[PDB]
Amino acid sequence: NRIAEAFEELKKKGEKALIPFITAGDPDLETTLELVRALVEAGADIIELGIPFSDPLADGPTIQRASQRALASGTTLDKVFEMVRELREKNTDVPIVFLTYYNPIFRYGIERFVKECAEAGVDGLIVPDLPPEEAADLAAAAEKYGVDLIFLVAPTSTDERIKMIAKHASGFVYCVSVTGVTRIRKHTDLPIAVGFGISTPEQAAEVAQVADGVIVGSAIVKRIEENQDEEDIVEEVREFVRELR
Amino acid sequence: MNRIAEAFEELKKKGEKALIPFITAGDPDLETTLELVRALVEAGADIIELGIPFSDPLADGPTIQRASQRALASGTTLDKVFEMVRELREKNTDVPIVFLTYYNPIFRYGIERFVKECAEAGVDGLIVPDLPPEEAADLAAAAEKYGVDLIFLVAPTSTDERIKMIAKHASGFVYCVSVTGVTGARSEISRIRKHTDLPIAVGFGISTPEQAAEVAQVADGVIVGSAIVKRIEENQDEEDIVEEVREFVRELREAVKLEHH
Amino acid sequence: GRFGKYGGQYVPETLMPALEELEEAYERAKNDPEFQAELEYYLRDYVGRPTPLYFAENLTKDLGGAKIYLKREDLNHTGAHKINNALGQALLAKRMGKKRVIAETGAGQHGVATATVAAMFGLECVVYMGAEDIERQALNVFRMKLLGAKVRPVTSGSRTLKDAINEAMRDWVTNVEDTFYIIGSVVGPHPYPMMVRDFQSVIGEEARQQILEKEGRLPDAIVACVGGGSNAMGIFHPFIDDESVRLIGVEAAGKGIETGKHAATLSAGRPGVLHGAMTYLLQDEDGQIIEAHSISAGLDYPGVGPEHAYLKDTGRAEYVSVTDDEALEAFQLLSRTEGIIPALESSHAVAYAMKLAPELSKDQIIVVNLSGRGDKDVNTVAR
Amino acid sequence: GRFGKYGGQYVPETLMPALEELEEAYERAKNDPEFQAELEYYLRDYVGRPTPLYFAENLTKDLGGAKIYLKREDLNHTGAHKINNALGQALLAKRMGKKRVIAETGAGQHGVATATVAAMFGLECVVYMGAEDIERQALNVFRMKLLGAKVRPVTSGSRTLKDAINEAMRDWVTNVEDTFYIIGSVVGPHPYPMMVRDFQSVIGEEARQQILEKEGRLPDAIVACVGGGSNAMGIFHPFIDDESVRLIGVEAAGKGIETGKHAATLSAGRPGVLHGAMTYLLQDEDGQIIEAHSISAGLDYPGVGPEHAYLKDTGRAEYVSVTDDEALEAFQLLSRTEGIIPALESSHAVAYAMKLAPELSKDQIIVVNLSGRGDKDVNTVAR
Ligand SMILES: *Cc1c(COP(=O)(O)O)cnc(C)c1O
Ligand SMILES: O=P(O)(O)OC[C@H](O)CO
Ligand SMILES: O=P(O)(O)OC[C@H](O)CO
Ligand code: NA
Ligand code: NA
Ligand code: NA
Structure with missing residues (x-):
C-alpha cells in the first residue's frame, strides 16, 4: 500500500509524517486538485481528502462549513474519484486517504465503493462513524482490494477498546488528541498519527516529537475559507504547510 | 286613593280601556322625556310607565336595551328622573306615573329611601322586572307604608298557584305578560287571572293599532313600549320625535277601546 | 337557595x-x-380525573417556609376545572x-x-x-x-x-x-x-383525601383564585367543616385597588343583585354594573358567587388580592421552578401562596388550587 | 443494541x-x-398518569364498524407523550x-x-x-x-x-x-x-390493562402515528407477543409520496445510517440526508427508529400513510364528534382508523394512540 511505503521511507530518514486534511470541493474541485498538488510540493507525506457529508457528526465549525460549501459546489463521490484519477495521471506517488462518513459509503454500495477506490488510486479510508464492530463488510471489501481502513482512538478509549481497534487497524492508527470535535500513544505495531486541534507550527512539531505523524485539518481549511477567492488560497495554503514541514 | 286606582275606576265608569305607554326615561335625554310625557298625556295615555335605565336589563329585548344604553350615556340617574317627575307634578298632578326599574338601582339607592322619594316626587307605582314576590318582602312593606303600588308580572307559564301568590301581593294592577320571553314588538298573541279583582293590563309585543285593539277586548288595559321607543330611536333626529310619537299614540288611543258593532 | x-x-x-x-x-x-x-x-x-396533588418541592425550598402542594386542575381535559x-x-x-x-x-x-x-x-x-x-x-x-x-x-x-x-x-x-x-x-x-x-366539589373531595394520604394532616391553608368563584368553592367546600383549615380566596387587584382598575369584588364591591343573585358586586353609586379589570380575562366577572359573599361575612374564608405584576411574577416563577405553566388566573393564587409560605413553618402545608394551564396566556405574558 | x-x-x-x-x-x-x-x-x-382509555361512542357510531378506543396521551402534562x-x-x-x-x-x-x-x-x-x-x-x-x-x-x-x-x-x-x-x-x-x-411502554402497559377491564379481551388492532416512532413503540411493545393484535403505524405522506415532499420513511425510504442507527432513511442518490415535509412538523424526522425497521421487515407491524388532507379531515371529525382536538401528528392515526373501522366487525376493537392534544396546531389548521 502507498501508505505503508510512505511511513517506511520516512523512518529510513528518521522523519515524521505531515498529513494535511482538506475538504474536497471547497471552494470547488478544480481548486482542490491544485491544492493537492501544492500540498505535494510543500512536502505532504499523505493527503486526506474530506468527502463532504450533509451531517458531519464528528466535525467542528470549520470543517462543517467547508463540507457545506463543498456540497453547494456539487461535490459528490464520483466527482472526487474523477479528480483522484486526474491526479494519478501524474502523481502516482502521493498516498490519498478518503475521510468519509459511512452512509455515503453504504448508499454508493460497499463493494462498489471500495472497488472504485482501488481503481481511482485511493489508498486508505477513514470512516469517522463506523467502529470496528460494525465495519465487517467494509473490512472484507477493503481487504480484497488492498485499501487500508484507518481507525481512530481517543484519549477516553478504554484499554480493551484500544486492543480491539488495534487488531483491526490497517495503514495507520489515528490518535484523536482530545475528546471533542475538530502516551496517549502506544503501542501496537502500526504507525501512529495524532490529529485534532493542532493549528500552529509550534504545536505540530510538539506532536511530531511524540508520534509518527501529525494530522492537520481545520488549521488549513481556515486559510482556504479566509482567502478571498483570489488564490492566494493555494499560495497561503502552501506557505502555511511549508512552515508545518 | 292611589292615582292608579283612580284612573282605572274612572275608565270603568266611562266604559273605556287603559292605554299605558312605556318610554325609557332619558332617551334621548330627560328634557325630551318630559316633552314626551306631556305629549303622551295629550294623546290620551291613562298611565305612563317610565323605564329607569339599567346597565343589565335581563327582561328587555334589543329595542329597550338600546334605549337604556342611550339613556345611561346621556347621564340618566334615579335622582334625575325624580326631579323630572317633580317638574311634571308642578303642572300635572293627575297622570299616574309608574317607574319600571330593575332591583339593583333600587337596592343601592336604599329601599325605604327609594319608596319615600317615590311618594314625595309623585310616583304612583313600581314595576320591578327581576323581583318575584318571594324576594319582594322589603320593597312591598315600604310601598305599603307610603301608598306606592307594586305591580307584579304574571307570565303564560305561571301556575295557578304562582298566580294566587302573585295576586296576593299585587296592587295597582296586574301586569299580564303576553309572551314567555323578553320585551320587543312582535306580531301575534286565557288570562283570565281572576283570582284577583285588580285591573289586568297586557304587555309585551303589542306593536300596531290592530294588535292594541285585539288586546283591548280582553283586558282592562294595554301596555305598549318597544313600538313607541322605536319611533323615538328612529328620529334620527329632530325633536320632531314628539310628533311621530304623538301620531302613533293617537292611533293607539283610537284603537284601545271596546269594539263597535 | x-x-x-x-x-x-x-x-x-x-x-x-x-x-x-x-x-x-x-x-x-x-x-x-x-x-x-x-x-x-x-x-x-x-x-381524566382524579387529578394529582403534586408536591412542589423546588418551590417549597425556594420560599423557605410551608410545603406547597398544587391541586393539578391544569391536567383536566381542556386544561381547566x-x-x-x-x-x-x-x-x-x-x-x-x-x-x-x-x-x-x-x-x-x-x-x-x-x-x-x-x-x-x-x-x-x-x-x-x-x-x-x-x-x-x-x-x-x-x-x-x-x-x-x-x-x-x-x-x-x-x-x-x-x-x-x-x-x-x-x-x-x-x-x-x-x-x-x-x-x-x-x-x-x-x-x-x-x-x-x-x-x-370533586376537586376538594379528591384534594382532602390526597393530602391526608400524602401528609397525614389537613392543609394549614387552601389558596384559590376567585373570579365568579367556582374553582374556589370546589376546593373550599369539602373543607368547610375542618375548622383548622384556612380558606383564602385571591381576587385580581389589576393595577391596584386604589387605582379603581381591579376585579376585587369581595374586597371592594358592595352588596347588590346581579344575574339573579344577591351578592357582592362591582357597581357604581347608581347601582350600575362596572367592568372589572385584570391582566387575566378569566377573573373579569363583576359579581361573585353568593356563597363566597356568605363565607366572607361569616369569616369562614378570607379574601385577599394580588396585582397583575404579582400574578406575572408567580406565572414566571412557577414555570421555571416546577415546569408548570399556570393560567394567569391561577397565578394569582400562586402569588399569594408565595407571600404566605415563607411566613409558615416547614411542617405546615399550603394547598394551591391550580385551576388551569397557562398555555393560553403565553402570548399575553410575552406582550 | x-x-x-x-x-x-x-x-x-x-x-x-x-x-x-x-x-x-x-x-x-x-x-x-x-x-x-x-x-x-x-x-x-x-x-398525571395513568391516562384514560376512552370509548369514542359518537365516532364509533359515525364510522359504522369496529369499536374505537382512544388512549388519551393528550391528557399528559404538556399535552403529549x-x-x-x-x-x-x-x-x-x-x-x-x-x-x-x-x-x-x-x-x-x-x-x-x-x-x-x-x-x-x-x-x-x-x-x-x-x-x-x-x-x-x-x-x-x-x-x-x-x-x-x-x-x-x-x-x-x-x-x-x-x-x-x-x-x-x-x-x-x-x-x-x-x-x-x-x-x-x-x-x-x-x-x-x-x-x-x-x-x-407505560402507554401500552396501561392500555393493555385498561382494554382487558373494559372489554375482557385484547384489541383487534392498535393504530399509532409514526415519525421517529416513539409513541408507536410505547403502545406497540406490550402487545408484540400477542399475535392476535395487529400493530399499525401511520406515516405522513404530506402532499402525496409522488410529490416528493413527504415524511414517509418506512414506505418510501431505504436502509442507511443516521445519527448512530442503521434504519430506514430519507436520503438522496449520494446518501445525503434529505429533509421531510408534512403538515405536522412533529413528523419531519428524516429517519425512523430501527425497531420499526425491524418490525416492518419481519411483518409484525404494518406501516401505512395518510396525506395532509386526510389528517386535516380527521382533526376536524374528532373535534366535532368527541370534543377532542388532537395533535396533527395523532390525527394521522385517527385518519387511518377512520378507514379501518368500517372494514371491521362491530364486535371488534381498535385502540388509537392519541399521542397529543391539538391546541398547538389550531393556528396551522386555520391557514
Ligand atoms: C375561568 C377560570 C377561573 C375563574 O373562574 P372561577 O369561577 O372563579 O373559578 C379561574 N381559573 C381558571 C383556569 C379559569 O379558566
Ligand atoms: O485539525 P483538526 O482538528 O480539524 O483535525 C484533523 C482533521 O479534521 C483531519 O482528521
Ligand atoms: O311593548 P313591549 O314589547 O316593549 O313591552 C312593554 C314594555 O316594554 C314594558 O311595560
Ligand atoms: Na368578581
Ligand atoms: Na389520571
Ligand atoms: Na421519519
Missing part, C-alpha cells in the same frame, strides 16, 4: 317556571345513583330532554368546556360571547367552532361577559322547551350556585 | 465511552426497583449526578417536554433548535425560555432538526462528565432506541 342573606332567585316571572323545573330536576339527579355513576364514568375516562361543571350540567340537560345547550363565556374557557362536552354528548351548542372578548380570544373562538358550537357575538351593552350572560338568559327564557343554560360559575339564581359548587 | 440488521452504534470513537456508561447506567436503572418507584411517583403526581420519555431520561440524569441535560427539538415539543422536566428536577437545560425551526415556532421557543431553558439556535447545515441533533451530539461528547443528552424519539445509537421504547 340562600346563603345567609345572599343568593336568592331575582329573575323575571317569565323565568320562574324554568327555575322550578331545573331545581326539581337537579334534586332528582343529585340523588339518583345512575346519574352520579354516569357522571363519574365521564369524569374518569373523558375528563370548568369542564367538571359543564359536564355535569350537560348530563342533566340530556336527562331533562334538552337537545340544545347554551353558555356564556368571557375569556372563552367555559365556552370551550361547554362546546367540548356538547360535542361528546351530541348536543347542539351555542356560546354567547361579548364582542370585546371575541376580539381578544380569536384562538378560543376557533376552538369553539372546531368543536361544532355556534358563537353568537354580543354587541349590546358593554360587549363583554356580563352582557353575554344577559343574552344567554334571554335565549334561555325564550327557548326553555328545548334549551338548557349551562352557567359557567357559582353565580346566578338558585339552584345554579348550589349546583355548580356541587359539580366542582 | 441490534434489531435484526438494524440499530447498532454508528458513532465516532470519541462517543463510545459516553455510550458505554449510558448503556450500563440504564441497564441498572431498568432493573432497579427504587429508580422505577421514583419514576412511577413522578409519572403519577407530576405527569414526549414527557414520559423526557421524564425517564431526566430522572436517570439526576440520579447519575448530572447537572445539565441537553435536547434537540424540531417543532419544539420535545424541547418543551425536556425543559419542563429539567425545571422540575432542578437541572440546567439547553435545547438545540435549527434556526429555520426557531423562526416557525416562536410560541414554543418562548415557553422553553419560560421554563428556564436556554435555546441554542443552530444556523449550520440546513438549520433544522437534523442539524440540531448533530450539534447536540457535539455538545454531549464535549461535556459528557456533567451533561446528559435526552434524545426525543426511539432513534440514534444503542441504548437510546431501547431506552426510549422502555420509557414509553
Whole structure:
C-alpha cells in the first residue's frame, strides 16, 4: 500500500509524517486538485481528502462549513474519484486517504465503493462513524482490494477498546488528541498519527516529537475559507504547510 | 286613593280601556322625556310607565336595551328622573306615573329611601322586572307604608298557584305578560287571572293599532313600549320625535277601546 | 337557595317556571345513583380525573417556609376545572330532554368546556360571547367552532361577559322547551350556585383525601383564585367543616385597588343583585354594573358567587388580592421552578401562596388550587 | 443494541465511552426497583398518569364498524407523550449526578417536554433548535425560555432538526462528565432506541390493562402515528407477543409520496445510517440526508427508529400513510364528534382508523394512540 511505503521511507530518514486534511470541493474541485498538488510540493507525506457529508457528526465549525460549501459546489463521490484519477495521471506517488462518513459509503454500495477506490488510486479510508464492530463488510471489501481502513482512538478509549481497534487497524492508527470535535500513544505495531486541534507550527512539531505523524485539518481549511477567492488560497495554503514541514 | 286606582275606576265608569305607554326615561335625554310625557298625556295615555335605565336589563329585548344604553350615556340617574317627575307634578298632578326599574338601582339607592322619594316626587307605582314576590318582602312593606303600588308580572307559564301568590301581593294592577320571553314588538298573541279583582293590563309585543285593539277586548288595559321607543330611536333626529310619537299614540288611543258593532 | 342573606332567585316571572323545573330536576339527579355513576364514568375516562396533588418541592425550598402542594386542575381535559361543571350540567340537560345547550363565556374557557362536552354528548351548542372578548380570544373562538358550537357575538351593552350572560338568559327564557343554560360559575339564581359548587366539589373531595394520604394532616391553608368563584368553592367546600383549615380566596387587584382598575369584588364591591343573585358586586353609586379589570380575562366577572359573599361575612374564608405584576411574577416563577405553566388566573393564587409560605413553618402545608394551564396566556405574558 | 440488521452504534470513537456508561447506567436503572418507584411517583403526581382509555361512542357510531378506543396521551402534562420519555431520561440524569441535560427539538415539543422536566428536577437545560425551526415556532421557543431553558439556535447545515441533533451530539461528547443528552424519539445509537421504547411502554402497559377491564379481551388492532416512532413503540411493545393484535403505524405522506415532499420513511425510504442507527432513511442518490415535509412538523424526522425497521421487515407491524388532507379531515371529525382536538401528528392515526373501522366487525376493537392534544396546531389548521 502507498501508505505503508510512505511511513517506511520516512523512518529510513528518521522523519515524521505531515498529513494535511482538506475538504474536497471547497471552494470547488478544480481548486482542490491544485491544492493537492501544492500540498505535494510543500512536502505532504499523505493527503486526506474530506468527502463532504450533509451531517458531519464528528466535525467542528470549520470543517462543517467547508463540507457545506463543498456540497453547494456539487461535490459528490464520483466527482472526487474523477479528480483522484486526474491526479494519478501524474502523481502516482502521493498516498490519498478518503475521510468519509459511512452512509455515503453504504448508499454508493460497499463493494462498489471500495472497488472504485482501488481503481481511482485511493489508498486508505477513514470512516469517522463506523467502529470496528460494525465495519465487517467494509473490512472484507477493503481487504480484497488492498485499501487500508484507518481507525481512530481517543484519549477516553478504554484499554480493551484500544486492543480491539488495534487488531483491526490497517495503514495507520489515528490518535484523536482530545475528546471533542475538530502516551496517549502506544503501542501496537502500526504507525501512529495524532490529529485534532493542532493549528500552529509550534504545536505540530510538539506532536511530531511524540508520534509518527501529525494530522492537520481545520488549521488549513481556515486559510482556504479566509482567502478571498483570489488564490492566494493555494499560495497561503502552501506557505502555511511549508512552515508545518 | 292611589292615582292608579283612580284612573282605572274612572275608565270603568266611562266604559273605556287603559292605554299605558312605556318610554325609557332619558332617551334621548330627560328634557325630551318630559316633552314626551306631556305629549303622551295629550294623546290620551291613562298611565305612563317610565323605564329607569339599567346597565343589565335581563327582561328587555334589543329595542329597550338600546334605549337604556342611550339613556345611561346621556347621564340618566334615579335622582334625575325624580326631579323630572317633580317638574311634571308642578303642572300635572293627575297622570299616574309608574317607574319600571330593575332591583339593583333600587337596592343601592336604599329601599325605604327609594319608596319615600317615590311618594314625595309623585310616583304612583313600581314595576320591578327581576323581583318575584318571594324576594319582594322589603320593597312591598315600604310601598305599603307610603301608598306606592307594586305591580307584579304574571307570565303564560305561571301556575295557578304562582298566580294566587302573585295576586296576593299585587296592587295597582296586574301586569299580564303576553309572551314567555323578553320585551320587543312582535306580531301575534286565557288570562283570565281572576283570582284577583285588580285591573289586568297586557304587555309585551303589542306593536300596531290592530294588535292594541285585539288586546283591548280582553283586558282592562294595554301596555305598549318597544313600538313607541322605536319611533323615538328612529328620529334620527329632530325633536320632531314628539310628533311621530304623538301620531302613533293617537292611533293607539283610537284603537284601545271596546269594539263597535 | 340562600346563603345567609345572599343568593336568592331575582329573575323575571317569565323565568320562574324554568327555575322550578331545573331545581326539581337537579334534586332528582343529585340523588339518583345512575346519574352520579354516569357522571363519574365521564369524569374518569373523558375528563381524566382524579387529578394529582403534586408536591412542589423546588418551590417549597425556594420560599423557605410551608410545603406547597398544587391541586393539578391544569391536567383536566381542556386544561381547566370548568369542564367538571359543564359536564355535569350537560348530563342533566340530556336527562331533562334538552337537545340544545347554551353558555356564556368571557375569556372563552367555559365556552370551550361547554362546546367540548356538547360535542361528546351530541348536543347542539351555542356560546354567547361579548364582542370585546371575541376580539381578544380569536384562538378560543376557533376552538369553539372546531368543536361544532355556534358563537353568537354580543354587541349590546358593554360587549363583554356580563352582557353575554344577559343574552344567554334571554335565549334561555325564550327557548326553555328545548334549551338548557349551562352557567359557567357559582353565580346566578338558585339552584345554579348550589349546583355548580356541587359539580366542582370533586376537586376538594379528591384534594382532602390526597393530602391526608400524602401528609397525614389537613392543609394549614387552601389558596384559590376567585373570579365568579367556582374553582374556589370546589376546593373550599369539602373543607368547610375542618375548622383548622384556612380558606383564602385571591381576587385580581389589576393595577391596584386604589387605582379603581381591579376585579376585587369581595374586597371592594358592595352588596347588590346581579344575574339573579344577591351578592357582592362591582357597581357604581347608581347601582350600575362596572367592568372589572385584570391582566387575566378569566377573573373579569363583576359579581361573585353568593356563597363566597356568605363565607366572607361569616369569616369562614378570607379574601385577599394580588396585582397583575404579582400574578406575572408567580406565572414566571412557577414555570421555571416546577415546569408548570399556570393560567394567569391561577397565578394569582400562586402569588399569594408565595407571600404566605415563607411566613409558615416547614411542617405546615399550603394547598394551591391550580385551576388551569397557562398555555393560553403565553402570548399575553410575552406582550 | 441490534434489531435484526438494524440499530447498532454508528458513532465516532470519541462517543463510545459516553455510550458505554449510558448503556450500563440504564441497564441498572431498568432493573432497579427504587429508580422505577421514583419514576412511577413522578409519572403519577407530576405527569398525571395513568391516562384514560376512552370509548369514542359518537365516532364509533359515525364510522359504522369496529369499536374505537382512544388512549388519551393528550391528557399528559404538556399535552403529549414526549414527557414520559423526557421524564425517564431526566430522572436517570439526576440520579447519575448530572447537572445539565441537553435536547434537540424540531417543532419544539420535545424541547418543551425536556425543559419542563429539567425545571422540575432542578437541572440546567439547553435545547438545540435549527434556526429555520426557531423562526416557525416562536410560541414554543418562548415557553422553553419560560421554563428556564436556554435555546441554542443552530444556523449550520440546513438549520433544522437534523442539524440540531448533530450539534447536540457535539455538545454531549464535549461535556459528557456533567451533561446528559435526552434524545426525543426511539432513534440514534444503542441504548437510546431501547431506552426510549422502555420509557414509553407505560402507554401500552396501561392500555393493555385498561382494554382487558373494559372489554375482557385484547384489541383487534392498535393504530399509532409514526415519525421517529416513539409513541408507536410505547403502545406497540406490550402487545408484540400477542399475535392476535395487529400493530399499525401511520406515516405522513404530506402532499402525496409522488410529490416528493413527504415524511414517509418506512414506505418510501431505504436502509442507511443516521445519527448512530442503521434504519430506514430519507436520503438522496449520494446518501445525503434529505429533509421531510408534512403538515405536522412533529413528523419531519428524516429517519425512523430501527425497531420499526425491524418490525416492518419481519411483518409484525404494518406501516401505512395518510396525506395532509386526510389528517386535516380527521382533526376536524374528532373535534366535532368527541370534543377532542388532537395533535396533527395523532390525527394521522385517527385518519387511518377512520378507514379501518368500517372494514371491521362491530364486535371488534381498535385502540388509537392519541399521542397529543391539538391546541398547538389550531393556528396551522386555520391557514
Ligand atoms: C375561568 C377560570 C377561573 C375563574 O373562574 P372561577 O369561577 O372563579 O373559578 C379561574 N381559573 C381558571 C383556569 C379559569 O379558566
Ligand atoms: O485539525 P483538526 O482538528 O480539524 O483535525 C484533523 C482533521 O479534521 C483531519 O482528521
Ligand atoms: O311593548 P313591549 O314589547 O316593549 O313591552 C312593554 C314594555 O316594554 C314594558 O311595560
Ligand atoms: Na368578581
Ligand atoms: Na389520571
Ligand atoms: Na421519519
